[PDB]
């Protein structure tokens, strides 16, 4: 009976709510009320990257925290150098409309996905000396929103068909699909242990997955609009979400609940890209009002405004060593702050 | 700098020069976005105008190389990837004139004409589409001409009170689409009634696009 199944689902949701309330005794504010203030974090544009003819939609760093890849809407995937302004590579993309980009942790591959519905893997290291296509991952029936590299052979990809899938490169098929979302999946973040990843989607719900088992362990809902960004805490046991409701939320995995809301009355514009600092104390969110707001993660007090862009900040990238925050916006520039 | 760094700087300068040349080549090419409801004539427009992912139609007219993008595939809520097409010069909208008396199969209460009306209302008043002009194509002109005698338009529009003639009904549909433009100051809507056989549709798009280019040039100069 469909009514019986619906009643069982409602009862189980009530049980989950009861358990969540029981496990919650003191909010994060009470413990962090006695913690020291983070101070006024001020940043300057150390390096401005120019050469994109359209709006930058994605940007990822490398393992060395020296190189950088940027995806615009003119079909160009320029591999930059943040140390010295230098275009290492320029991949001409068949699918100009690109919404995501990724850099392999080893540094030999990159990826680009957009409304084309394909995660095109590119071979940076080669004997012929030019960057070409590794393979075309065409298994998704929705637009490519985000993709991240598990390894040189495994890539986790999120799409607009409310599903995500782990790919195996040497075969080019979906090793394990992830299903259970009812809205456009926007962003994913592989955890440091390369076992779990959170997929915030457009149904105001972010779902944790384990890559190996392939089934959803935890579901989080505290939002009211589409979650447009996600980023694991560097510890890997927490993660932040940025949504169109102009609020950022931090969730803890063990307690399975929202902890802090990063909301201000002056903010009406919804977040697009969210990234953490190296220690996780600092939460950088690329807001929709042409600015990047810097939030203390433990204490919900804003501590900086990386206002240097004339258009919407779409991608945010923090270096692995935490020495630079690349902010790529729609004014066709990337800015490195430190 | 060292010799390797000097070579790196030379390589970066070459890549920048090639990107600049790519920008030179794409100056005259112009980016249109095709939208419309189901079976509203989108395929007819593409087939005329040449002669999953999103489809791209490339076609030339007096040094204007138009790239039209169709996102009929990859169906989503459309509030999530529309910001890609903010920089497009023109939205070629397709609306079915013959859809006034034919309702949606999924929901007969939802008239397809009303669905096209609502989706145009969404497009013409949208966050990223305030400035983009719209070229309006009323397709199925022959079918609508045949159906104007058959079915009274009042069954579709409660406000319909005019005679059931091809002309007056056509202009009434035209206004029902145009006066959705609340801010009829910056964006301009060019309305054309195509008959699924007209050969000047690409010709219409040519001068509509040149007009939009001139309008944007005046706006950038401030003379407009």
């Amino acid at each position, epitope marked *: 009976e469909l009514d019986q199944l619906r009643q069982e689902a409602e009862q189980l949701k009530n049980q989950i709510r009861d358990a969540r309330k029981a496990c919650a005794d003191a909010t994060l504010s009470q413990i962090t009320n006695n913690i020291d203030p983070v101070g006024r974090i001020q940043m300057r544009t150390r390096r401005t990257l120019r050469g994109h003819l359209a709006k930058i939609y994605a940007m990822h760093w490398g393992t060395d925290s020296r190189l950088l890849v940027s995806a615009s809407q003119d079909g160009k995937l320029i591999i930059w150098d943040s140390y010295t302004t*230098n275009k290492v590579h320029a991949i001409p993309l068949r699918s100009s409309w690109v919404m995501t980009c990724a850099y392999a942790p080893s540094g030999n591959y990159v990826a680009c996905g957009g409304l084309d519905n394909i995660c095109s893997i590119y071979n940076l290291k080669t*004997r012929e*000396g030019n960057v070409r296509v590794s393979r075309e991952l065409a298994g998704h029936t929705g637009y490519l929103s985000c993709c991240r590299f598990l390894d040189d052979n495994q890539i986790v990809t999120s799409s607009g068909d409310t599903t995500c899938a782990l790919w195996d490169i040497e075969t080019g098929q979906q090793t394990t699909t992830f299903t259970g979302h009812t809205g456009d999946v926007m962003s994913l973040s592989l955890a440091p242990d390369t076992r779990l990843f959170v997929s915030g989607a457009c149904d105001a719900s972010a779902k944790l997955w384990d890559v190996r088992e392939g089934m959803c362990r935890q579901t989080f809902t505290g939002h009211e609009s589409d979650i447009n960004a996600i980023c694991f805490f560097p510890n890997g046991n927490a993660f932040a979400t940025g949504s169109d409701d102009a609020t950022c939320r931090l969730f803890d995995l063990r307690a399975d609940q929202e902890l802090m809301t990063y909301s201000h009355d002056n903010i009406i514009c919804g977040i697009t890209s969210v990234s953490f600092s190296k220690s996780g104390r600092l939460l950088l969110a690329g807001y929709d009002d042409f600015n990047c707001n810097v939030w203390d993660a433990l204490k919900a007090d804003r501590a900086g405004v990386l206002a240097g862009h004339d258009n919407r900040v779409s991608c945010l990238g923090v270096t692995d060593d935490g020495m630079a925050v690349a902010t790529g916006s729609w004014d066709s520039f990337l800015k490195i702050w430190n | *700098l*060292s*010799a*390797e*760094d000097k*070579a790196a700087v030379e*390589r970066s300068k070459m890549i920048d020069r090639n990107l600049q040349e790519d920008a030179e080549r794409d100056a005259r090419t112009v980016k249109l976005l095709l939208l419309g409801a189901g079976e509203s004539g989108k395929s007819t427009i593409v087939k005329q105008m040449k002669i999953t992912g999103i489809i791209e139609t490339q076609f030339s007219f007096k040094d204007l190389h138009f790239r039209m993008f169709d996102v009929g595939g990859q169906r989503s809520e459309r509030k999530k990837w529309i910001h890609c097409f903010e920089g497009v010069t023109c939205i070629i909208f397709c609306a079915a004139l013959s859809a006034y008396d034919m309702v949606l199969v999924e929901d007969e209460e939802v008239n397809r004409m009303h669905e096209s009306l609502h989706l145009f209302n969404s497009i013409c008043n949208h966050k990223y589409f305030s400035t983009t002009s719209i070229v309006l194509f009323l397709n199925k002109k022959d079918i609508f001409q045949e159906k104007v005698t058959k079915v009274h338009l009042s069954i579709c529009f409660p406000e319909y009170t005019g005679p059931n003639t091809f002309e007056d009904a056509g202009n009434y549909i035209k206004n029902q689409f145009l006066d959705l433009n609340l801010k009829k100051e910056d964006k301009e809507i060019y309305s054309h009634m195509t008959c699924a056989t007209d050969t000047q549709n690409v010709k219409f798009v040519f001068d509509a696009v040149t007009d939009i280019i001139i309008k944007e040039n005046l706006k950038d100069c401030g003379l407009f």
Partner: single-chain antibody
Framework: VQLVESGGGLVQPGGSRKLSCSASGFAFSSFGMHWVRQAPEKGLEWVAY????????YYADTVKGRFTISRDDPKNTLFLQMTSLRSEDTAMYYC??????????????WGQGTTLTVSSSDIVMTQATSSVPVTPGESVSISCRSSKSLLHSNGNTYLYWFLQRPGQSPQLLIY???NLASGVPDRFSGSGSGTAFTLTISRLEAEDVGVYYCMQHLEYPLTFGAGTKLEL
């Protein structure tokens, strides 16, 4: 990838010729293309260097003005025009491709080379070790000394190690004095203090037999070493 060359032969002193290197299997228009010589029983000496797009032109002081180097991207061909040739130019000419970034491998590939017969301030780098009797399975290191410290201000040392099998072309072993070139066994490695360098080799095989050279890439008068030989 292949860079088989042509031209050269038996010429009179004070003659004219046009040596050609033909490219295949790689993006020629993006690479930097060098010309490297080799006296009949001596080491190598850098001679000419075209850049991508011919923006940068460099010649050795010995062939300065005398030789001209040019590239042909549409046909993927290198040229080295020579006039007023002298007896010092009897050499095993090579065309060498060097790509243009850090994290990349300059002098990655060497052509087959053509034979030329003639009738009747730069950082010097030396390898005083010269002849080294070696046996398979024994670790042997090759030392190279530089006249100027090779640690640039960018923290990137510039030293390149090559191994020349008998009757073959030099193959890059180590680039930037530490990194291992592609397709090179992991036995090879490099270390040093920035002025004195060693090329440590693990258990030796028939492949390692040959003569090894070291090149600096800091100041563009790229000087190769005398050439340490490993005889088994």
């Amino acid at each position: 990838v292949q860079l088989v060359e042509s031209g050269g032969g038996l010429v009179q002193p004070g003659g004219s010729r046009k040596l050609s290197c033909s490219a295949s299997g790689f993006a020629f228009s993006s690479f930097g293309m060098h010309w490297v010589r080799q006296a009949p029983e001596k080491g190598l000496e850098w001679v000419a260097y075209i850049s991508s797009g011919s923006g940068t032109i460099y010649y050795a002081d010995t062939v300065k003005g005398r030789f001209t180097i040019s590239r042909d991207d549409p046909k993927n061909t290198l040229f080295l025009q020579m006039t007023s040739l002298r007896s010092e130019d009897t050499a095993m000419y090579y065309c060498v491709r060097s790509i243009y970034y850090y994290g990349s491998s300059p002098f990655d590939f060497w052509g087959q080379g053509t034979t030329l017969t003639v009738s009747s301030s730069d950082i010097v780098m030396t390898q005083a070790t010269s002849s080294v009797p070696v046996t398979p399975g024994e670790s042997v290191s090759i030392s190279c000394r530089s006249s100027k410290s090779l640690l640039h201000s960018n923290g990137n040392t510039y030293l390149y190690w090559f191994l020349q099998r008998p009757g073959q072309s030099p193959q890059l072993l180590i680039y930037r004095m530490s990194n291992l070139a592609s397709g090179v066994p992991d036995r090879f490695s490099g270390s040093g203090s920035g002025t004195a360098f060693t090329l440590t080799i693990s258990r030796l095989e028939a492949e390692d037999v040959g003569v090894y050279y070291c090149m600096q890439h800091l100041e563009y008068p790229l000087t190769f070493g005398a050439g340490t030989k490993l005889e088994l």
